[PDB]
Amino acid sequence: IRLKAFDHRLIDQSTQEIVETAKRTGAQVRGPIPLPTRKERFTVLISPHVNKDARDQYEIRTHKRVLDIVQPTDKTVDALMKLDLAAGVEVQISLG
Amino acid sequence: VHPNGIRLGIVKEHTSVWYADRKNYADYLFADLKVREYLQDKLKSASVSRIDIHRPAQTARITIHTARPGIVIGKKGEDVEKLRQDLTKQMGVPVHINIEEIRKPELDAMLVAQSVAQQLERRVMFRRAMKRAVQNAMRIGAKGIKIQVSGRLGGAEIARTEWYREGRVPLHTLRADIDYATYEAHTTYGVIGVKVWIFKGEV
Amino acid sequence: RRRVAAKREVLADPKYGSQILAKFMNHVMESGKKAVAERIVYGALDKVKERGKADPLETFEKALDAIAPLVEVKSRRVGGATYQVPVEVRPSRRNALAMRWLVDFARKRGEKSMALRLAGELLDAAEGKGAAVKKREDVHRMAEANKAFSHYRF
Amino acid sequence: KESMKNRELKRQLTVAKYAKKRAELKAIIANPNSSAEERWNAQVALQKQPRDASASRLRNRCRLTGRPHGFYRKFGLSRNKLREAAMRGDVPGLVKAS
Amino acid sequence: PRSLKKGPFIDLHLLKKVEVAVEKNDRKPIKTWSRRSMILPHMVGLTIAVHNGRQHVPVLVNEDMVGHKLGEFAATRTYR
Amino acid sequence: ATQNYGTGRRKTATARVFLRPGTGKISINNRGLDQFFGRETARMVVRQPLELTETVEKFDIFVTVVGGGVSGQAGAIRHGITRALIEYDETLRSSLRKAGYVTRDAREVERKKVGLRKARKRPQYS
RNA sequence: UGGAGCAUGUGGUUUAAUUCGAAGCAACGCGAAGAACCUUACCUGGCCUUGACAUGCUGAGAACUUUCCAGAGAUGGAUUGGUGCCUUCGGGAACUCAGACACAGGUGCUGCAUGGCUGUCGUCAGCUCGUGUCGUGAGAUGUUGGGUUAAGUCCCGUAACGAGCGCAACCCUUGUCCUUAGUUACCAGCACCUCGGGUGGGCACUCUAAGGAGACUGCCGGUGACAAACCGGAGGAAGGUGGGGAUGACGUCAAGUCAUCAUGGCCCUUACGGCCAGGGCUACACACGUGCUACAAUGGUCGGUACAAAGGGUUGCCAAGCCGCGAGGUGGAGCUAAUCCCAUAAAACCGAUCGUAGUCCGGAUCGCAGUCUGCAACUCGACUGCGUGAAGUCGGAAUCGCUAGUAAUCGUGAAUCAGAAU
């Protein structure tokens, strides 16, 4: 189970719905392994009339998470794979 | 520096919550632009308070947050499917349409901002209903409304900073949630963008 | 205009164990790298006493015995002409020009090796017949007209 | 001008009007196994086959507004957009932190 | 850059009224619509007047030429 | 035993203290102190606490630090010399403050502000 | 700063066609936050009579192929095929282009009847208001005084009492504490190894923290009206103040665009609706906004150290390259990156022989000439091989400018998915 999604508050609250949801069905899903902040620095110019001093600053992230089903039989990671998404998560899975 | 971009987080949420690749980060940022300009220049009636363009499993999700359900929903949804065709063709992906309710609508910024500039074309005084912009919209709910009005105001070179304070608005804030709706219009001569600081309670 | 400045020099080393030459690595590491400066920083210590008989500090301790002026020259005016004020200051003030002035005036000599250049006049601090003990007594001499400049109109 | 954005946007089709004889005859060019008698058939490739064939004459702007600066590798949008977009919410993922 | 990788100048929309001029006698020029209308090094002894917009220039094509564009006959900056 | 986890840091580290009683034996980066460090003046500067506390004959020291450069982590051997030792006892407890070797400093290269050139260094003007 | 090492940075220079921009050491951050087929700042070859495009009335033939032909140069037309399309078997449609009325084009003028979420405060807590009082009034008081502070945080007094707007708290925001943490990294437990770790196990002698107690007016002693403050103190390898400002707290100097969305007193109106444009901006005659590099001595010319190295990467980055002195174009392991393509590196050891110099630091017009974008490098390009053609002398008149991690010399990885942003 390798993932590709948005932020610090919708993939961690969707891999709450992966470990327990496929552990109750008989097999075992290991714990969530940390993968930190994506550190990407940007530059703009925010002045109405042009003022190279008057910049601003931005940043954007992508979280991944490493889970691994020990003996691969969990269909919940693929059947309830749309349960992992609510509005804007597009789930990547890896069966094994 | 602009805050509402700071409280993308501890206060509020987003409107375009869809995941794609990093190269595909622009591919659904095509069609987030032909539908949002349609609700303003056509649906001045049933005023929109927020446009969320979500892309869930296999179609889309755009919720036109109106304040008038009887005009949009008419005779078992005859005008509901009208917005299905004029939008989803120019937009890339089709949309399934669901309509919610914003009962007690007198506390939101966009729901009032489209109801100020439309009265200023009919040769109405620019200082009477702006007091009753706060006197008629503060009886139940929120705690205060500051209004900066700098602008045009019937004459040519006016820099008058009107100060419609009745209550409390703090504007350095993140917990004290600021809303800000500057919709523009053109009256009998000149441009009017109505500046709005409606402010509900904290927590 | 209260002074919130706090002075505290670190005086201890794993090589020399000195006092006013231990933490001196600042002007001998000439904006570059310590690897090249390490043989120039503490390479001169055992180069000033390697040409003489006494230890490095022997003629390094006697630098403030003939290179420290007995007055001050900070200007001030009251309603006429600017008058400076010269008087016995604290050791620190007087003993600041008794090393750095003797040290920095070694670029107008420059013999073989950069470390010898730094050590060029470190052994001069005893007899004081160099250039650092030429401006020491000079300072005293320019205070005849400034002699009575301290109390009245100063 | 009503006809400045209209006279250059149409190169999405015209530059790629053949696009296959151009795709086949821009890969063998990096191969010297072509003979010296073949220094002329590699030069009956693409040009007077009408000259909307050079890709050197195309340029981007904003999606609604039309501006060449401020374009990053993640949008179709510009720098006077990005202050007015995420503050109403048009830009995903763009939060403010360290 | 600009090494001698692209050796021969075979360009059929720019070839077909310069190389064909061998059979016809020299009483008329080759008429140019570029700042960059180069031709083959087999055709030294012709006339190429640099297209830029209002009058043509004296181009004395002599026996020894190998290198670059025609930006020296009618120069880039013309000292107006 | 004494088979414990200390640390020592300067300029973005995460260290390894493989320490025990011994006789002042000092080591770093799967090597000794006189392998990567040497022919430089910060060597005996960490012996200045090691002479303060007479611990040059009573402990065997393996503290590892990496990152930064050559000599910017001279202070990181300095950082956790008694971080493996005030865990062992409180014998040198109220006698170590005069040394002054633990302060993870913030006089560093933090965020880089726009408009200026560097840390708090300013551009050229009149 | 300096006779001076002659950059469009505006004022003095060279046309045969020339459109607006600041008004000080706030004059190279003055329309727009980019002039690659001109449907742009009337050179314009050039032609309009309906139309790419915005537009109603009408069409063969829907369409394209319109490769190729004049073209050293858009396209009409040969256009090689297609008849397309729903069928109450009536009727209908879009378009390479095309004919008649009107037009879109301001592509000159002009911030003085039209900018909104600033191009100038040193970071001043300073500028105001409601009511009350005093004055015939304009006003004033509040906001003065005594003390204190970066600071209307204040405190004590007072015809004022409140308030609008603050660092604090809502704005660089978790070594410091952490449940749980590394399916392919590698070697603390280890055997191993080529001691580069193949590989279990590495959650414990650990591998890049999402986010969470975090740092104080907290106490003691005096000084101060003891009161706002101001000095001295612990813990203990860290205990008292460390504003990090795009809807400035708001108050500031007839002045940049009838111009990025806007917005007027005259204009083209067979036209700046036509477009394939037959070339006409640096004579040096200088000042100047001057802002790295040194003064020959730490001396003059190499291929080498313990040694940077991860991501973006379905028309991309382009190995150890055979090519090499130095060129990693036919190859291609990283092809969706806990690999890698720029994959090489780091001022050090005692760096050769001769020991301290406007030169054995110096090459502007004469790099000719070399299987790489590809229908398009005929007297100019990186391609640094050093035979040659120089000028760097204590910085004085007086002036940019420094109270603490500060005055202070090792590079950017990535596209509208084809690798010279000082």
Side-chain angles (χ1 to χ4, degrees), chain A, chain B residues 1-9 13-21 23-57 60-203, chain C residues 1 3-7 9-152, chain D residues 1-32 34-37 39-98, chain E residues 1-9 11-79, chain F:
Chain A
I1 303 99
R2 57 186 66 192
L3 289 87
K4 288 179 177 64
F6 260 173
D7 53 3
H8 50 275
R9 61 260 175 95
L10 293 173
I11 194 172
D12 292 333
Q13 297 181 358
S14 292
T15 60
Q16 290 170 356
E17 294 179 354
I18 293 170
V19 179
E20 182 68 28
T21 59
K23 185 174 73 176
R24 188 179 67 190
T25 58
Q28 183 65 41
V29 178
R30 292 179 184 264
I33 311 299
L35 287 171
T37 294
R38 191 64 50 83
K39 299 175 181 180
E40 293 171 350
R41 291 174 58 85
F42 294 146
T43 46
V44 296
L45 201 73
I46 205 158
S47 174
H49 179 71
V50 61
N51 188 357
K52 185 67 77 69
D53 292 330
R55 297 196 187 279
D56 205 357
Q57 54 192 356
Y58 283 99
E59 193 179 6
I60 200 163
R61 294 178 184 88
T62 291
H63 280 90
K64 295 186 173 68
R65 180 73 73 189
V66 175
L67 295 174
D68 45 350
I69 54 173
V70 180
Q71 183 66 41
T73 186
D74 289 330
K75 80 281 193 185
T76 303
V77 309
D78 291 333
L80 292 174
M81 184 178 173
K82 65 182 182 293
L83 186 64
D84 298 332
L85 60 90
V89 179
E90 287 293 327
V91 177
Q92 184 186 1
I93 203 68
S94 181
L95 192 75
Chain B
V1 101
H2 228 140
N4 286 320
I6 304 168
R7 61 173 69 86
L8 296 178
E13 291 181 354
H14 296 286
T15 72
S16 67
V17 186
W18 51 266
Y19 184 73
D21 289 329
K23 58 171 286 295
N24 294 323
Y25 191 80
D27 278 332
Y28 284 163
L29 279 171
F30 175 77
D32 296 334
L33 297 176
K34 292 180 183 177
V35 182
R36 290 193 176 100
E37 285 192 356
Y38 189 80
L39 305 183
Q40 289 180 353
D41 294 333
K42 188 255 178 64
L43 286 174
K44 289 184 283 186
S45 176
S47 65
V48 185
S49 67
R50 187 178 296 275
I51 298 167
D52 295 331
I53 301 179
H54 295 286
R55 303 290 176 87
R61 182 176 293 171
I62 297 172
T63 62
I64 303 168
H65 286 286
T66 61
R68 290 179 180 176
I71 299 169
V72 177
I73 298 169
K75 292 181 181 180
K76 292 182 181 180
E78 292 180 353
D79 291 331
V80 178
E81 293 179 354
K82 187 257 183 65
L83 296 173
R84 183 178 179 178
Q85 295 177 356
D86 285 328
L87 294 176
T88 60
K89 296 177 184 179
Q90 300 176 357
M91 182 173 175
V93 299
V95 182
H96 291 285
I97 299 169
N98 290 318
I99 299 169
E100 293 179 353
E101 292 180 353
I102 312 173
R103 293 180 181 177
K104 293 181 181 180
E106 290 183 353
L107 295 177
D108 292 329
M110 284 295 292
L111 299 181
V112 179
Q114 292 184 358
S115 66
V116 174
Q118 292 184 357
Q119 294 179 356
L120 300 178
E121 296 179 355
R122 294 179 181 177
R123 296 180 180 180
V124 180
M125 294 298 289
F126 296 92
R127 290 180 180 177
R128 294 183 184 177
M130 283 296 292
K131 296 176 183 177
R132 288 184 181 178
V134 183
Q135 293 178 358
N136 288 320
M138 286 299 297
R139 299 295 296 163
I140 298 169
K143 299 284 102 175
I145 298 171
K146 285 176 65 180
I147 298 169
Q148 168 194 6
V149 177
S150 62
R152 186 68 182 268
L153 290 168
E157 289 187 354
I158 284 174
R160 294 181 188 181
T161 67
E162 291 171 351
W163 187 55
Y164 297 101
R165 286 201 71 251
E166 289 171 353
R168 291 178 178 176
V169 175
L171 290 178
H172 280 268
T173 71
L174 290 174
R175 299 300 303 161
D177 293 331
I178 303 162
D179 293 333
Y180 191 82
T182 59
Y183 177 77
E184 287 186 358
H186 299 281
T187 55
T188 182
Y189 58 98
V191 187
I192 290 183
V194 168
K195 288 184 179 182
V196 171
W197 288 266
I198 305 168
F199 171 75
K200 291 187 285 185
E202 57 94 21
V203 177
Chain C
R1 204 272 196 219
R3 66 97 71 171
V4 292
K7 316 278 359 295
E9 142 81 332
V10 160
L11 344 92
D13 239 326
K15 273 138 262 275
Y16 207 51
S18 28
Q19 250 290 292
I20 12 254
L21 166 93
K23 239 16 139 171
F24 99 138
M25 261 160 242
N26 172 356
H27 308 73
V28 197
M29 211 98 60
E30 300 213 15
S31 275
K33 30 41 215 357
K34 180 203 227 159
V36 122
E38 198 286 341
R39 260 188 335 164
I40 279 347
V41 164
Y42 276 156
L45 229 32
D46 25 306
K47 227 198 255 236
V48 131
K49 109 292 205 295
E50 153 224 335
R51 129 78 10 175
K53 297 263 175 127
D55 344 351
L57 59 161
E58 184 86 87
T59 336
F60 188 94
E61 281 175 302
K62 245 214 295 228
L64 330 82
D65 266 31
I67 313 166
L70 234 353
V71 279
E72 211 193 57
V73 245
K74 281 286 122 198
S75 242
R76 92 179 317 150
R77 227 210 53 134
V78 60
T82 336
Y83 306 137
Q84 284 153 326
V85 229
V87 90
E88 179 135 13
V89 221
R90 96 187 89 169
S92 92
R93 179 107 206 152
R94 329 164 49 280
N95 300 122
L97 344 189
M99 285 225 282
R100 256 181 349 108
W101 294 26
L102 164 74
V103 159
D104 193 17
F105 280 63
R107 304 138 170 265
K108 284 182 202 107
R109 169 141 5 169
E111 248 125 278
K112 265 153 234 210
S113 327
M114 258 5 243
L116 156 44
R117 227 209 228 55
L118 170 105
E121 275 234 325
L122 313 206
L123 18 105
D124 272 295
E127 29 193 335
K129 16 126 54 72
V133 182
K134 219 204 298 98
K135 197 208 269 84
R136 191 246 182 226
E137 291 310 54
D138 174 21
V139 170
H140 296 57
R141 302 301 61 98
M142 180 234 272
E144 267 29 296
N146 234 79
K147 235 272 211 204
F149 287 174
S150 94
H151 303 302
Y152 344 133
Chain D
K1 300 183 187 183
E2 191 174 4
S3 67
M4 186 175 182
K5 292 182 180 181
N6 199 2
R7 68 181 180 179
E8 293 182 353
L9 184 63
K10 64 186 292 293
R11 294 182 186 272
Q12 188 176 2
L13 293 172
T14 65
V15 178
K17 192 170 174 66
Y18 285 166
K20 301 284 103 175
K21 295 184 286 293
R22 296 181 69 249
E24 290 176 353
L25 293 174
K26 281 176 94 288
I28 307 170
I29 292 172
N31 291 318
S34 180
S35 65
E37 293 180 353
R39 288 176 181 174
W40 180 58
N41 60 8
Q43 301 174 1
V44 193
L46 300 180
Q47 288 184 2
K48 76 184 183 186
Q49 290 182 353
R51 66 167 62 94
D52 55 359
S54 68
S56 299
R57 306 177 76 89
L58 196 274
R59 192 184 186 91
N60 56 359
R61 286 181 182 179
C62 181
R63 182 67 264 166
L64 285 172
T65 307
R67 193 68 184 170
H69 262 295
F71 181 77
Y72 295 156
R73 73 277 300 277
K74 304 298 181 185
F75 291 98
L77 304 175
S78 183
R79 195 168 74 192
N80 50 10
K81 178 72 176 178
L82 196 277
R83 189 181 186 266
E84 297 183 358
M87 297 301 162
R88 295 180 186 270
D90 301 338
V91 179
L94 191 69
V95 297
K96 290 178 71 71
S98 63
Chain E
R2 288 308 289 259
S3 59
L4 206 68
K5 310 287 182 178
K6 177 57 69 71
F9 187 76
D11 191 8
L12 288 175
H13 78 275
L14 194 56
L15 185 67
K16 56 170 66 177
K17 281 193 72 65
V18 196
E19 188 181 2
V20 184
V22 175
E23 296 292 327
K24 297 293 178 69
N25 295 115
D26 186 75
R27 292 181 185 271
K28 76 281 188 186
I30 307 297
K31 192 175 286 185
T32 292
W33 292 282
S34 296
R35 291 291 299 266
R36 289 175 288 178
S37 292
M38 295 171 286
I39 63 176
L40 287 169
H42 295 284
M43 294 184 288
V44 176
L46 274 72
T47 297
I48 295 294
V50 178
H51 152 68
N52 204 8
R54 71 99 54 221
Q55 92 275 25
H56 293 284
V57 293
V59 175
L60 188 61
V61 175
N62 288 318
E63 56 183 358
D64 296 329
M65 290 170 70
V66 64
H68 76 288
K69 298 179 186 179
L70 307 169
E72 300 184 0
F73 299 100
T76 65
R77 274 80 54 85
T78 65
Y79 176 68
Chain F
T2 60
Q3 193 177 7
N4 295 318
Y5 178 70
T7 184
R9 282 182 287 270
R10 174 66 178 85
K11 189 62 64 67
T12 66
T14 302
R16 291 190 174 180
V17 177
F18 300 177
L19 198 143
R20 67 180 65 91
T23 55
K25 293 180 285 294
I26 179 66
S27 183
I28 185 166
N29 297 322
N30 287 322
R31 299 179 183 182
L33 186 67
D34 285 329
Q35 298 292 316
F36 181 75
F37 296 94
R39 190 248 174 273
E40 54 194 0
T41 57
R43 293 181 64 248
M44 280 68 75
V45 177
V46 296
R47 288 179 182 87
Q48 290 176 354
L50 187 68
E51 70 180 359
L52 179 65
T53 61
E54 64 267 13
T55 53
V56 76
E57 72 272 14
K58 291 190 284 187
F59 291 102
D60 192 358
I61 299 97
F62 186 84
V63 181
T64 296
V65 72
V66 292
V70 178
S71 297
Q73 291 180 350
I77 296 171
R78 181 172 60 86
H79 184 272
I81 182 164
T82 48
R83 193 183 288 274
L85 294 178
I86 68 166
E87 295 176 354
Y88 287 171
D89 55 356
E90 288 84 0
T91 302
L92 271 298
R93 185 65 175 170
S94 296
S95 296
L96 283 171
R97 178 69 90 198
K98 194 188 289 183
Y101 295 146
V102 79
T103 304
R104 188 257 182 86
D105 197 7
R107 300 176 299 183
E108 294 294 327
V109 282
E110 290 293 331
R111 55 88 47 85
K112 196 169 183 178
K113 288 183 182 177
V114 303
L116 304 176
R117 296 183 66 84
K118 297 298 180 72
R120 286 186 183 177
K121 191 184 74 65
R122 58 180 297 164
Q124 191 171 5
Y125 67 105
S126 290

